[PDB]
Amino acid sequence: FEARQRIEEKNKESSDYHAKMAHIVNTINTEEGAEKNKYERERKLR
Amino acid sequence: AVPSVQTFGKKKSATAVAHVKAGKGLIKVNGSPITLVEPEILRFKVYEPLLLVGLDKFSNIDIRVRVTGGGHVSQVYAIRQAIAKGLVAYHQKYVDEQSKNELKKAFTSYDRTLLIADSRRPEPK
Amino acid sequence: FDRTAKPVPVITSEVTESLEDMIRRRIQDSNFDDLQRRALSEELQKAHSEISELYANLVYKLDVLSSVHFVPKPASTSLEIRVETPTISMEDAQPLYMSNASSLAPQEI
Amino acid sequence: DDQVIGKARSRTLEMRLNRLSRVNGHQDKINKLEKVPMHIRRGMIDKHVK
Amino acid sequence: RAWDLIRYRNFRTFTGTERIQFNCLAVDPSGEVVCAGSLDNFDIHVWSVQTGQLLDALSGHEGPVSCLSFSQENSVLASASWDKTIRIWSIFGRSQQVEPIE
Amino acid sequence: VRKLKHHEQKLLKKVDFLEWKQDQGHRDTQVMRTYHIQNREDYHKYNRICGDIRRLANKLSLLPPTDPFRRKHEQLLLDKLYAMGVLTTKSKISDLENKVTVSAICRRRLPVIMHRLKMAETIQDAVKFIEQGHVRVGPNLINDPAYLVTRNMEDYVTWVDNSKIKKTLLRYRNQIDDFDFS
Amino acid sequence: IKDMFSSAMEVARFEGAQIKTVSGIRGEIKRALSKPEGHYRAAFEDKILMSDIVILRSW
Amino acid sequence: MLRRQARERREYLYRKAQELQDSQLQQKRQIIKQALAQGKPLPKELAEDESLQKDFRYDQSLKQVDDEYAATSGIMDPRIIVTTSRDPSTRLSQFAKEIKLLFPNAVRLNRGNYVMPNLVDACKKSGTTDLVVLHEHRGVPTSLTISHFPHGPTAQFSLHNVVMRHDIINAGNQSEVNPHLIFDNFTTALGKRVVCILKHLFNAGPKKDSERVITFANRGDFISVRQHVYVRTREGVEIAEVGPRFEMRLFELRLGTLENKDADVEWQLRRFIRTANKKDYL
């Protein structure tokens, strides 16, 4: 019984951790590569 | 330069190679004579290829049989099948064909498992 | 401590009743995963006729090359009619005959 | 198409494949001319221009 | 295929589901059953003559069924094939019995 | 013929006494050398048949891509050549034009089937062995090397019984049973 | 496996755990043995050697 | 037929390797088919090669069960041999009886002194299709191995929560009519392969009013097998539990019969990987 409970709580924990870190990596990539490409788009017109 | 004829007999996992060549009349199984084949109540199973057709067939050839595998009764059955088809094959090759198929008629009328083993089994009912 | 695999699930009344009404829904909706028992154009009709003739000649010489061990074509439930005629007239030319019935049966008449 | 019989079919397909292929493929390699000798390709061109 | 020599007609055509080429056939005495054996299939195809269907396919040879015959008295099927084996099938009457002879 | 000097080689450029244009690069000679074909017209009698298959696949590809006459006849021809062994696989229909070939029909011969079945050491020795009359397919002996051995019928290429070659491989593995003649 | 437990009750308490040797060969406790008290059967990735030490990391 | 079945295996796995090899041609042929469908440009690798286009003229007229069962999927009903391990106990012989009642067209064979090589040879030359080998542990049946015979696949399962129709009560006889089947959430490709394995050993095409159902319900890699009879009443369906119930777990699927154990494995249960207990149908 404790086998099944511990394995399922572990898998829930790890599948939440992957979601959280992929979320913050993708928002840092998207909404700041927007600003990096915006600045290089306003540095190639200088 | 000498006539020689090799045949094989087989039962369940026994095997018996018989070499028949033109000789003095001596029949040997595993180096010992044919009269020392155990378990001695199946010695007449070994003896019946000889006595079915008479010892005058054997009086000029000399057979030797190497037997391997199986148990006691598998070994005596492979020995008798090797003796039978070895004598028939020697008579086909170096003696006349009339005597060859007279020997075939004698062994087949006694039991054709002296010449053809039951090879592939079973049946899916 | 950590454990290797999830243990074999114990079979309680809750999982038997969830299994059973899964079957009840499938069996009243008749959703079963069973096995299942198994005019054109003038230019197009003449193109078809040309490659029909070509395919028949080619199959003939492939069979006489293959020394007629081959594998046959599948099947065609065709439809052939037969007129009602004496089997004297359905024979070969010789002085005799072999049967004098008619080529259609009483029930076919 | 589903109604175009032989030679118009093969050349319609060849025409379409060349036209779709010319966008991304190299200009040196999409239109390969047939290896025709000099004195008869010049002759073909002269009579065709006539 | 069956030929009636009275109206000169082909009244039955028996085919297998496999499209193989048959090289020997044998008919029952009371022509209920026609069997035929190929040189590339190892089975013996048994069709009924009244209903045209394939009644069964007898398997058990491990070589091409070279020749077939039906015994004209007790109606047993003797087949014989290139696996050095003749083989006697009691087909009719609840038995379905096979007897191999090497 | 005398390894022409330079002005001669410039003045007569098309002269060649061995390789002509109608020879097509001596492929009759070259694939009959590869597969050890005995008589001279077997390449071209196979080439007529490759021409017929490729003509039919051409005319049969010229039909519209959807119609069932085209699809059915391409599949019939494809299964026919695969079961005859001329094709290697019935995957795509461009095998009917690309990969049907006199060398394919020749690889399906009997000495080549012998060699690929390891029943001889080379195609010349397979030709010698079946000219010498050792090889049967099924029950009956085959004597000419041109015999074409289809996919079902290459399970029956054996030697004849009483052949000295069958005797010597059985007695190499000293399994020779002199009861049944070999 | 010989002695990391003292009895079949302890092995029953620790069935199904993941163990490993010092050579990284993973494995798992399968069943408490019957005849010696603290011994058990474990199934590993491949054939471990007699010179190894199995290991159950716990907290 | 030994030579013929050997080279038929040889040719089939040659064709298998060829298709996985040149199945890039299938997809770039599909690419230029859809590019002629919607008139969009062709990528550079396909635009520069003249061979695939003049082969596309021929290949334009090209275009569900899997490779082992395809030749006779719905045509011929199966023939199934059910056998036990060796010197079986009495509850294992009762279980083999119950399994041959589970599958129609299944006979039961007595096992003893049957080498599994010549049992495979005898089976596949007397023309059966499936072989179900049962393994016990002091009465309790622990494994079953399903073998499809024209050099097909063997799926080995272990059975877990076994209750038997003998061991309940004297409840009567079974139905033995051709049953319907229920296959629940076999979602992955291995689940579909196992669905094909498991359902091609029932007779094809049951009746629409056939009153016997037998369900394989995947619940976390544990295929729960139950068997039922029913009668459709005026408000719902009343389900009655006939026949044995268990849970089978697939632990191996290889691509030959039982006799070799040199077959190329399609899927065997990776038990001691680091991510062993995270995914299903792993």
UniProtKB/Swiss-Prot annotation, chain A:
Superkingdom of the organism of origin: Eukaryota
Biased amino acid composition, Basic and acidic residues: 33-46
Sequence segments annotated as region (Disordered): 28-46
Location(s), subcellular: Nucleus, Nucleolus
Quaternary structure (record): Interacts with snoRNA U3. Interacts with EMG1, MPP10 and NOC4. Component of the ribosomal small subunit (SSU) processome composed of at least 40 protein subunits and snoRNA U3.
Family according to the record: Belongs to the NOP14 family.
Role of this protein: Involved in nucleolar processing of pre-18S ribosomal RNA. Has a role in the nuclear export of 40S pre-ribosomal subunit to the cytoplasm.
Protein name: Nucleolar complex protein 14
Organism the protein comes from: Saccharomyces cerevisiae (strain ATCC 204508 / S288c) (Baker's yeast)
Gene name in the database record: NOP14
Positions spanned in the full protein: 761 to 806 of 810
From Swiss-Prot, chain B:
S-S bonds: none
Keyword check for Ribonucleoprotein: yes
Main localization, broad class: cytoplasm
One Pfam entry name: Ribosomal_S9
Location(s), subcellular: Cytoplasm
Residues with PTM Phosphoserine: S32, S59, S74
PROSITE patterns given in the database record: RIBOSOMAL_S9
Function text: Component of the ribosome, a large ribonucleoprotein complex responsible for the synthesis of proteins in the cell. The small ribosomal subunit (SSU) binds messenger RNAs (mRNAs) and translates the encoded message by selecting cognate aminoacyl-transfer RNA (tRNA) molecules. The large subunit (LSU) contains the ribosomal catalytic site termed the peptidyl transferase center (PTC), which catalyzes the formation of peptide bonds, thereby polymerizing the amino acids delivered by tRNAs into a polypeptide chain.
Note: Present with 33800 molecules/cell in log phase SD medium. There are 2 genes for uS9 in yeast.
Subunit structure comment from the entry: Component of the small ribosomal subunit (SSU). Mature yeast ribosomes consist of a small (40S) and a large (60S) subunit. The 40S small subunit contains 1 molecule of ribosomal RNA (18S rRNA) and 33 different proteins (encoded by 57 genes). The large 60S subunit contains 3 rRNA molecules (25S, 5.8S and 5S rRNA) and 46 different proteins (encoded by 81 genes).
This protein's name: Small ribosomal subunit protein uS9A
Gene that encodes it: RPS16A
From Swiss-Prot, chain C:
Disulfide bridge map: none
Compartments, as annotated in UniProt: Nucleus, Nucleolus
Its biological purpose: Involved in nucleolar processing of pre-18S ribosomal RNA. Required for the early cleavages at sites A0, A1 and A2 during 18S ribosomal pre-RNA processing.
Family note: Belongs to the MPP10 family.
Subunit-structure text: Component of a heterotrimeric complex containing IMP3, IMP4 and MPP10. Interacts with snoRNA U3. Component of the ribosomal small subunit (SSU) processome composed of at least 40 protein subunits and snoRNA U3. Interacts with the SSU processome subunits EMG1, IMP3, IMP4, KRR1, NOC4/UTP19, NOP1, RPS4A, RPS4B, RPS6A, RPS6B, RPS7A, RPS7B, RPS9A, RPS9B, RPS14A, RPS14B, UTP1-UTP18, UTP20-UTP22 and UTP25.
Listed name of the protein: U3 small nucleolar RNA-associated protein MPP10
Organism: Saccharomyces cerevisiae (strain ATCC 204508 / S288c)
Covered range of the whole protein: 347 to 495 of 593
From Swiss-Prot, chain H:
GO molecular function: RNA folding chaperone; rRNA primary transcript binding; single-stranded telomeric DNA binding; snoRNA binding
Main location: nucleus
Classification via Gene3D superfamilies: Probable brix-domain ribosomal biogenesis protein
Pfam families per record: Brix
Keywords for the protein's UniProt record, in alphabetical order: Nucleus, Ribonucleoprotein, Ribosome biogenesis, rRNA processing
Biological processes per GO annotation: maturation of SSU-rRNA; ribosomal small subunit biogenesis; rRNA processing
Domain Brix, chain residue ranges per copy: 78-259
Effect of R193A: No effect on RNA binding
Keyword rRNA processing belongs to the record: yes
SMART domains, A to Z: Brix (SM00879)
Cellular localisation: Nucleus, Nucleolus
GO CC terms, sorted: 90S preribosome; Mpp10 complex; nucleolus; nucleoplasm; small-subunit processome
UniProt keyword Transcription, yes or no: no
Purpose: Required for the early cleavages at sites A0, A1 and A2 during 18S ribosomal pre-RNA processing.
Subunit details: Component of a heterotrimeric complex containing IMP3, IMP4 and MPP10. Interacts with MPP10. Component of the ribosomal small subunit (SSU) processome composed of at least 40 protein subunits and snoRNA U3.
Name assigned to this protein: U3 small nucleolar ribonucleoprotein protein IMP4
Taxonomic placement: Eukaryota, Fungi, Dikarya, Ascomycota, Saccharomycotina
